[PDB]
Amino acid sequence: GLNSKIAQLVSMGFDPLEAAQALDAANGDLDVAASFLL
């Protein structure tokens, strides 16, 4: 599940590590992690 979410964030133009770190903080909640990165 997590890798697919990282990939979603990378598809938005974010970098893999910043994406992973946002998802970690967000406990896997992609919508929250995206909001962080915007």
From Swiss-Prot:
Feature type site, description Involved in interaction with monoubiquitin and Lys-48-linked diubiquitin (Ub2): F14, A26, L37, L38
Marked site positions, Involved in interaction with Lys-48-linked diubiquitin (Ub2): D24, A25, A33, A34
Subcellular location per the Swiss-Prot or TrEMBL entry: Cytoplasm; Cell membrane
Entry superkingdom: Eukaryota
Transmembrane segments: none
UBA domain ranges (all copies): 1-38
Disulphide connectivity of cysteines: none
Entry similarity comment: Belongs to the DDI1 family.
UniProt protein name: UBA domain-containing protein Mud1
The organism of origin for this protein: Schizosaccharomyces pombe (strain 972 / ATCC 24843)
